[PDB]
Assembly symmetry: D2
C-alpha cells in the first residue's frame, strides 16, 4: 500500500523453504541437477542467476514498478551494461553535467567501440530534440545532476524518446525509488548506483537496473551473463537489508535538508545554494511534478578554497570522504576532488568555483547538523 | 621457496595494523581523508581499490610471477576487461574450441563493437601465423581446452605474438598457477576463472588477471575502474582462503587423475579418452614441457546418450552439476549441456559425440573414485 | 549531542588504519606478535578480543553511558554470564513475569549450581525489600516485561540494591538505549538481547552488556574469556550496522504504536490493552519518569483462541513468527506459543487468556498497520 | 567409504531446495510459521536451531561416528556446556596437564558452583581408578596433551568410566576426527576446539561436540538452548568449508612432522623432543593402537630463553602467534606464553623449561620447513 510498507513487504525477501524471514546468502557457484537439464528451482550457475541476487533484483523491480531487475558489481557496471545495448555507429545523448564516471566510461571506453556521444543541456528538452541525429539510439539523463543539482523533465524526455525511437534511461541514484519513479513516467530503463542511498550504509559497491520491457530485459540478461559484472550474494544480501530502512532514512535526510537550506540561505558567509527545493531553482516546478521529495545532496558557495577547507576542519559532524548516501553526513569540495583536472577558468565558467562545497546530508539529528554547519560557517 | 610454501606465504594476506593472520574483510565503500587528497593508506573509494581485493590481487600476481593483479566479479568479466584493451577494427585470434562463454562474449557482444574474431586450430602454431592480419592485435589461447583437452604451445605462441606485435593472453584456468605459469614463458597477460580451481570450493564466482607489463596494467586498471566489474570483499576473502589449499588439492586431484585414466583405458565400455597425460595425445610433449602437472578435467567416450545417463545415475561419488574445480568430483555430458545448440552432425564431426562424458576430478579418495566409476561403467 | 547523532558517531566504528568508514570484519582467530608478549594493537586471540567485536562493545558502552561493553553469542548467553558473577549459595531476585528463557536458565540450569532464585512482583519495590535474604546478591529486573508490559521503578530498584549491597541488573531489551538508560539511574549492569531491536533486522542472534563498574567489568571479561559465549565478527558487524538506524526505527515504531493503541481501545472486538503509554496502566507515571519513549510490543485481548487465529489469518502486514524488534510487524499468541506448558487455569489467573494477542510493531506505514489490524478485527 | 571421501560427502552440506552445492548461510534469527506451531522445516528461532549450524553439526556427528552434533561459539563454550551436565557436589577427573583454558574454567568458574575437580596423571589409567570418589560423575581427558604431548589410553578410560558410571569425555582437538575417533572406543562425548585444525584457516573461533547417546544429546541441547553459547551461521559455514580439506591438510602436516622430528633428533642444539610418534615416548604403543596418524604439534628443548627467541627470529616460515592448526606453521615458547604465571622452579620440575619451544606444523613444503628450522637451529 503506502511506500514504507512496500519497502518492507515488496519483493521476495524470505526463504520459501525454511521460512527464514531474511534472504539466505547463497555463497555458492553451482547447483545439483536431478536429471540433465532438470533444475530444481531454476538455478544452474551463479553467474547466470543466484537466489540472493534474485532477491535484490525482485526488490528493485518492485520499488521502481518494473518487471525485471538486474544487480551489477557497481553503478558503472550497470551503466556499461546498459550502454552495451548499442552497437558501433550508434549515438547516445546524455545530460551535459552527467556523473564523472559515466562521462569517462562513454568518452574513454565506449567511443573506442564506435559509440558516439553528445552531451547536451537537457534542462531544456528542445535541446534534446535539436541534438537527435539519424544514428541516435539512446537518451540517458540524471536528474537531479551532480554537483549543481540540475533538473531535467523526465516525462517530456520519455515522450521525445518514444517519438524518435530512442531507448530512454534515467540514472535515478540521487532521488531513489522512494521519491521518483521514472518507469511510471514512460522511461524504458531506470538504474542506480546502489552504493549510495539504497545500500545506505557505505559498505556495498553495487548497481541496480529495472525495466518493464521484456525485450530490453532479455538483452540486459544476455549482456549480464556474457560480460559478467554481477553482484555477489553477500553484497546482494546487504543491499536488501539496507533498503529496508530507505524510507525512514530518506525522510530524516529530507527534514534536515529543509532546515540546512534555510540556514545556508540566511548565512552571510554563503552565496549561491544549489538544490531543487529552492523555488528560484531552474525547473523547480518540473522536479515537484515528477518527485515527491528531495535528494540529500546540496552544493553551496563559500568565498574560496581556504574558506572551504576551514569549513571542513571546523565541522564536528560532517565527514570528509568520497561518495554520498551514507548514514553519516559527508562533505567535499568538487573543484579539488572531482573536477581538479578541468582547467580553472572552465571550472569557474561552469560554476565549479573554488569555494563550492558539496554536502551529502546523513541521518544525524537535524538540530545538530544545522548548528554544526552554522557554527563552522561562523568561523569564516 | 617451493610451491606449497609460496602458496601460504606469497602475497600480502595479513593485517599490518592489528597483526591478524588473515586478510580483514573491508565491507566498505569509502574512506576517511585526513586532508583533501591525503589518503591514509592509498584507499579512497572501493570500486577503485579495496584492501581485501588488493590482498587477492597480490596473491594472484605472486603466484603467476607477475607484477600486477586484478580481481573481477567473474571469469567472463576478466575476459571482457582484457578484450576491451582493443578498439573497433582490431582483430583477435583465439583457439578454435575456446570456452563457450568466451566464444559468446566475442561473437555476440564485442563484434557489435567492431572487434573482429578468428577461431583457429592453435595446436599447430603456424595456423596462428597464417591467420595473422594487418589488423590483428591480440592472441588469446586456452591450454588445455574444453572438453577435449587440446594443448597449445605457450612459448611459441608468445614468440609469435612478440614478433607480430600482438598482446598475448592465456586463459590458465584448467592448469592453475600451481602447474603452469604463462608469464614465465613470455605471455603478456594471464587470466583465470577463479570460480573453478583457485577458489576450489564452488562458493565464489570470480575472475583473476595478472601481468608484468606496467602499461597493460595501467590500461586494465583504467578499464576496471571505468566499467566496474570488480570482485567484492567477501568473495576476495573466500578466494584468498581457498587458494591456501590449492597445492594440496591439485596434488590429490592429479593422483586420482592418473589412476582414473588407467582404469578408463582398460575398460571395454570406454572408447577414446582425452587428457594431456596420455602419451598418444596431440602435443603431449608440449604440455610436459610447459607444465609440471595436469588438469583434473577428463573427457571420455561411452557408447551413446543412454549409456552416459546410466553412468551418471550409477555413480555414488560423481555429482551432476555445471562448472569444475570443486572439492567434489563433477560429471556432465557436453553434447547435452554445453553444445546442445550445435547441430548433431557438426557435434559428431567435432568429436562431441552423444556418449562423450566429462568429469572434473575432486579430492575424494583415489580408490573410491576409481572403483565408483569402474562399477558404474560395469553396469553398461 | 542529540540521540540520533550519538547513534551515528558514538563508539569507534571506523578503521584507523585505512580510514574505512565502516568497521572491518576481522574474520580471524589469532594475531602476529612482533616479539613474545608484544601485541601490535592489543590483540592476541579472538576469543579474548576481536577488533570487530570491540567495535560493537564500544557502541553499546557509549549508547548506555557505560564504560565497558561485552558482546555475547545470544541474549541468554549475556544473562548466563551475568548470573555467573554469583556463587553457590547466592540468591537472586527477579521480576515475577521475567522472560521465559531467563526463567528456564535460572530454575533449570543455575539452581543445579546452588544459585537460589525468588520471583517477586517488582511493580511494588517494597516487594523487593521484603524478599531480600541475608544471602541475596543480585537484583535482576526487566521493564517493561513480556507479554503484559509490567513496569518496574528502575531508580528505586537501584537505591534498594545499593542499600543492601546487591548487584543491580536491568534487561533493557524492550526499551533499547534510545529510550531508557538504566546505568544513568544507578543500575550496576544493563543488558540486551541484541537479537531484537538493536540488530533490528531479524538476522543476528546476539547479546550485549554494558557497565560503568571497573571491577564488575573485569569479572565479566574473565567469565567471557573462560566460558566463551562470544559474538563472532560477522554478527558484530551486522549489529553495528543495524544500530545505525535504531533511532529512526524506534521513532517510526512509536508513531505507529500510538495510533494502533487508539484503534485497539476504540474497537468493540478488543477488551483489555496492555502497554505503558496507556495512562490507566500500572506505573505509567514511573515509566514516563524513567524513559522518553515506548516499546513497540503491545498485548491485547480478543475473545478466544479462534478469534486470535482469525485475526492472524486476516492481517496482510502482520507476520506470524517468534521474536520481536524486526522491521516487519510480528504477531503471536502467548497462550499457544510461550505459555502453552503452563496449566490453563493458571494462565487465565495470570492474564494469559486464550485470546491474548501480542504484536511487535514494525516500521511499515502507520496508516497501513492501523487499517490492516482494524479490518482484521472487523472480521470478528 | 574411505576417509577423504567421507570428508567430502559426509553430513548434509547442500541445499535441498535450490540444489546449491554448498550450505546456504542463514543469516536470520526467526522463521515464518504457516500456522501456530507448524514449522515448515523444523526451524522456529535461530538460537534453538539454525540450518547452517545444523549443517556443521551433521558434519561433526558424521566424522566422529556419532548421532548428534552441537556447535558452540568457542572450544571453551563447548567445554562449559559439557561441564554443565554436572550438578553442585559432583566431581570431575581431568588429566593433569589439561589445556590452560580448561583448567581455568574448572578451577576459577565451576568450582564456585560446587563442581569438584581433581587433576590426575592419566598416562596410567589406574591413577584414574584411584582418584574416583563416590561423588565422581565425569572423566575428561585430552590425548595427546599440550605442550608435552602426553598420551592417555582412550579405550581403558572408557571401560573405567562405564564400570563406575561416569560420563566419559575426550577433547579430540589435537588429533581431529581424521585420525582418532573416541566414540568408536566407547567414550560418551567427544569435543573439539574447531578454532584449530577443523576450521584449519585461523579465521573461526568455534567448538564442536558429538555424541551417540540420545539422553546426553537431549541434555546438551537443553543447555545450549538455555545458556546460548551457539556458533553463528557465517562461522558455521566457514567451518564446513575448512573441514572439506581436513584430510589433505592433516596428511601434508604429518609428512612434515615425520621429517622435522628426524631433523630435531639429529640436531646438536636440540635436547629432548616430545611427540607420540617417537618410539621411546611414553604410551607410544597406546597412541598407535587408538589413532592412525599424528598431531602436528611438536615440543622440543633448546638451551635457554635467548636460544628460543633466536630460533624464532631466525626462521623464515614459522610465525610467532598463539593457537595451532593453521595453514601456516606457528611457533611459541610455553614458559613465556602459556605458563608464565607458574613459578619458575615448578615449571622446570614440570618440564616447561625456559628453552622449550612448541611448533604447530602447517602445510608449507616439507623440505622448506625442515631446512628453515634446521638453519635457524644452526645459528645457535
Ligand atoms: C502497497 C504495496 C504495493 C503497491 O504498489 P503501488 O505503489 O501501489 O504501485 C505493492 N507491493 C506491496 C508489498 C505493497 O505493500
Ligand atoms: C619461494 C617463495 C618465492 C619464490 O618464488 P619463485 O617460484 O622462486 O619465483 C616467493 N615468495 C614466497 C613467499 C616464497 O616462499
Ligand atoms: C552528543 C554525543 C555524546 C554525548 O552523550 P550524552 O547523551 O550527552 O551523554 C557522545 N558521543 C557522541 C558521538 C555524541 O554525538
Ligand atoms: C565411506 C562413507 C561413510 C562410512 O563411514 P565409516 O568410516 O565406514 O564408518 C559414511 N558416509 C560417507 C559419505 C562415506 O563416504
Ligand atoms: Na516480501
Ligand atoms: Na513504458
Ligand atoms: Na604472505
Ligand atoms: Na614478458
Ligand atoms: Na564514531
Ligand atoms: Na552507578
Ligand atoms: Na553430503
Ligand atoms: Na558407547
Amino acid at each position: 500500500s503506502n511506500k514504507k510498507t512496500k519497502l518492507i513487504h515488496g519483493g521476495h525477501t524470505t526463504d520459501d523453504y525454511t521460512g527464514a524471514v531474511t534472504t539466505p546468502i547463497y555463497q555458492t557457484s553451482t547447483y545439483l541437477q536431478d536429471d540433465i537439464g532438470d533444475l530444481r528451482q531454476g538455478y544452474e550457475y551463479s553467474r547466470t542467476a543466484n537466489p540472493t541476487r534474485s532477491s535484490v533484483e525482485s526488490v528493485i523491480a518492485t520499488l521502481e514498478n518494473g518487471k525485471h531487475g538486474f544487480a551489477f558489481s557497481s553503478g558503472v557496471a550497470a551503466i556499461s551494461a546498459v550502454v552495451m545495448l548499442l552497437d558501433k555507429g550508434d549515438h547516445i545523448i546524455l545530460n551535459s553535467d552527467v556523473y564523472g564516471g559515466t562521462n569517462r566510461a562513454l568518452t574513454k571506453v565506449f567511443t573506442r567501440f564506435g559509440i558516439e556521444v553528445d552531451f547536451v543541456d537537457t534542462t531544456h528538452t528542445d535541446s534534446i530534440v535539436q541534438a537527435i541525429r539519424p544514428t541516435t539510439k539512446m537518451l540517458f539523463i540524471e536528474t537531479p545532476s551532480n554537483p549543481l543539482l540540475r533538473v531535467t523533465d523526465i516525462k517530456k524526455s520519455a515522450e521525445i524518446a518514444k517519438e524518435h525511437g530512442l531507448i530512454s534511461v534515467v540514472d535515478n541514484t540521487f532521488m531513489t525509488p522512494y521519491y521518483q519513479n521514472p518507469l511510471d513516467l514512460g522511461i524504458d530503463i531506470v538504474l542506480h548506483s546502489a552504493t549510495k542511498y539504497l545500500g545506505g550504509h557505505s559498505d556495498v559497491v553495487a548497481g541496480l537496473v529495472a525495466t518493464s520491457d521484456d525485450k530490453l530485459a532479455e538483452r540486459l540478461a544476455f549482456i549480464s551473463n556474457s560480460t559478467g559484472g554481477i553482484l555477489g550474494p553477500q553484497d546482494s544480501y546487504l543491499l536488501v537489508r539496507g533498503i529496508k530502512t530507505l524510507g525512514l532514512r530518506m525522510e530524516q535526510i529530507n527534514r534536515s535538508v529543509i532546515e540546512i537550506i534555510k540556514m545556508l540561505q540566511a548565512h552571510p558567509a554563503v552565496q549561491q545554494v544549489f538544490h531543487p527545493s529552492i523555488e528560484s531553482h531552474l525547473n523547480h516546478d518540473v522536479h515537484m511534478a515528477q518527485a515527491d521529495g528531495h535528494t540529500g545532496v546540496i552544493a553551496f558557495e563559500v568565498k574560496n578554497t581556504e574558506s572551504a577547507k576551514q569549513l571542513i576542519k571546523a565541522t564536528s559532524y560532517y565527514t570528509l570522504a568520497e561518495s554520498l548516501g551514507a548514514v553519516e553526513s559527508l562533505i567535499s569540495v568538487p573543484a579539488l576532488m572531482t573536477h581538479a583536472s578541468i582547467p580553472a577558468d572552465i571550472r569557474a565558467k561552469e560554476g565549479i568555483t573554488d569555494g563550492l562545497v558539496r554536502i551529502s546530508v546523513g541521518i544525524e539529528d537535524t538540530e545538530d547538523l544545522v548548528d554544526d554547519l552554522k557554527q563552522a560557517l561562523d568561523t569564516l
